[PDB]
Amino acid sequence: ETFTNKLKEKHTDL
Amino acid sequence: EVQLQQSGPELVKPGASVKISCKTSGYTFSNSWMNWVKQRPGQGLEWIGRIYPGDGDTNYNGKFKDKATLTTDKSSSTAYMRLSSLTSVDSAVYFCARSLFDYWGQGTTLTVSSASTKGPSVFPLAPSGGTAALGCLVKDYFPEPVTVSWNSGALTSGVHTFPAVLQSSGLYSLSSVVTVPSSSLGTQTYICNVNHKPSNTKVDKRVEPK
Amino acid sequence: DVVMTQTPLTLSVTIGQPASISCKSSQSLLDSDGKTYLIWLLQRPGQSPKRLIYLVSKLDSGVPDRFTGSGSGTDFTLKISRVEAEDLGVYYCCQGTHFPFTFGVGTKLELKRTVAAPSVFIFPPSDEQLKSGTASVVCLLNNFYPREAKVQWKVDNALQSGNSQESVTEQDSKDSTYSLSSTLTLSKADYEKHKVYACEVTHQGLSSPVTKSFNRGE
Ligand SMILES: [Cl-]
Ligand SMILES: [Cl-]
Ligand SMILES: [Cl-]
Ligand SMILES: [Cl-]
Ligand SMILES: [Cl-]
Ligand SMILES: [Cl-]
Ligand SMILES: [Cl-]
Numbered sequence: 001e002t003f004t005n006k007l008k009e010k011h012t013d014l
Numbered sequence: 015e016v017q018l019q020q021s022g023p024e025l026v027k028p029g030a031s032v033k034i035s036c037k038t039s040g041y042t043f044s045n046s047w048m049n050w051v052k053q054r055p056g057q058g059l060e061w062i063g064r065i066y067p068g069d070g071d072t073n074y075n076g077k078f079k080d081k082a083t084l085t086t087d088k089s090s091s092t093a094y095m096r097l098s099s100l101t102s103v104d105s106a107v108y109f110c111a112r113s114l115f116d117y118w119g120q121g122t123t124l125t126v127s128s129a130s131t132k133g134p135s136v137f138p139l140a141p142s143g144g145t146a147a148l149g150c151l152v153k154d155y156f157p158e159p160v161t162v163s164w165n166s167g168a169l170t171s172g173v174h175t176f177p178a179v180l181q182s183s184g185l186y187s188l189s190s191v192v193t194v195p196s197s198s199l200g201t202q203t204y205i206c207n208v209n210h211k212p213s214n215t216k217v218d219k220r221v222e223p224k
Numbered sequence: 225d226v227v228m229t230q231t232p233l234t235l236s237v238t239i240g241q242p243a244s245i246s247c248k249s250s251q252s253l254l255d256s257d258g259k260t261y262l263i264w265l266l267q268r269p270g271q272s273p274k275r276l277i278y279l280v281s282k283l284d285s286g287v288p289d290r291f292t293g294s295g296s297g298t299d300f301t302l303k304i305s306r307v308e309a310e311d312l313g314v315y316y317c318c319q320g321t322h323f324p325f326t327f328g329v330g331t332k333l334e335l336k337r338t339v340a341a342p343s344v345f346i347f348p349p350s351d352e353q354l355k356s357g358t359a360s361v362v363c364l365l366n367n368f369y370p371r372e373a374k375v376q377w378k379v380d381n382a383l384q385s386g387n388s389q390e391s392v393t394e395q396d397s398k399d400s401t402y403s404l405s406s407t408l409t410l411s412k413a414d415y416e417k418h419k420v421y422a423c424e425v426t427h428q429g430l431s432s433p434v435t436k437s438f439n440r441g442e
Pocket of ligand 7: 385
C-alpha cells in the first residue's frame, strides 16, 4: 500500500 | 499504486438525478479525503465538495449544496456523488480527486438532455508514396463520449484520434487515423475499436484497402 | 470565495526556453497551521489533471526537476527551466486553504517549432456507408506546422463550396505538429453522379499546392 495516516487532518497525504 | 476508477458516462433527462461512483484501490480508503470536481467549458474547474470516509464528515461548496450529496461505502472502498434536479448547466465532466488533489479519477461525462441515445455509424477509411493512411469515421452519435483504440490498444504509433465535433444539427462525429508504411497495406491487421457506452454500441471494424 | 488569477493565459514557447506562470489569490493562502495549501496541476487534452507541485514548492513523485514552484502569501510562480515537447497542456493553480477550494482559469502552454508541410491522403466513401445511403469523402493533412492551412475540394474539376468541414487535432506531445481532417459531404446520388474527386492543399511549408485524387469506381 502507499503511505497514509489514520489521523484525520485538514488535508491528508501531505 | 493509488487508483481512482469512476463509473461510465450518463445521459439523463432534465429534472432527474444521477449517482456517479469512484472506486478506489491501493491505499487505506478511510484515511484520505475524497473531493469531487466539475469541469465545464467556460466554468473551468469547480470544487463541489469533499468527504472524509473515516467518519463521513462532509464539506460542500455553497454553490452545490442543494445539488450534490456525497456518501461512501467503506466495504467497497467507493465514494459516490449524487446530483439532483439536473439542468443543462449540469452537463459536464465530473472527477473524483483524493486529498489535496493528488490523484484523480479518469472523469465521468454527464449529459443532461431530453434527447435519446444514438449510436455511431462506424465506417472504414481505406486508401484507393512510402507512407499510407487508414482510419475509421465515427459518425452521427449522441451524447458524448466515444472511445477509439486500434488493435485493442496494441497499436499506438502513427495514430491520431480527432476531437469530437458537435454538428450544427445536434449530433457528434469524430474520426481516427493511422499512418503506416505503404507496405503494411492489405497485409497487416488494422482493427478500430469503437465504444459508445450510452447506447451500448461496441464495434470492432477491420480496415482494409478498397 | 477566494479568486485565483493566473497569468499569462497562453504561453507560446520554443523547446529549451524557460517559461513561467504566476497565480494571485484574493486572500493569503497561509493557513493558521503554518502550511500554504497551493498546488499546480497540468491537464493534457482529453486526460485528467495531474498534480505537479504541492505546498507551493514540493515536487510530486515522477515530476521532472525542470519544474519548480515558489511564492508566499497571495503570489505564486510555477517555473519550467527548459520547456520540452511533452510539457504541453493547460496548467492550473488551485488553493485548499479557504472553503470553497478554488482553481485558476488555466494557462495553455503551446510549443513553437519549425515549419513542416503536411503529408496528404484522400479516402473515398466506404461501400458500407454508401450501402447505408450517404457519402463522406475525407482528406487528411498529417503532421504539419503551423496550424493554418487551406483545403479545397474538386469534384469533376468543380471547386466545391459550402459542403466541407475541417477538424484539427490537439498539438502532438512528441513533435509539436498538428493534423487536420476535411470531410466533404454529398448525397449518395450526387457522389455516384461524378467521377473525379480531389483535395488540394496549400500550406506555408509548400512552394506549390499538393493534390491527391481518386476516380470513383477506380
Ligand atoms: Cl487514478
Ligand atoms: Cl448536500
Ligand atoms: Cl506519428
Ligand atoms: Cl463540443
Ligand atoms: Cl483473425
Ligand atoms: Cl451524405
Ligand atoms: Cl456555396
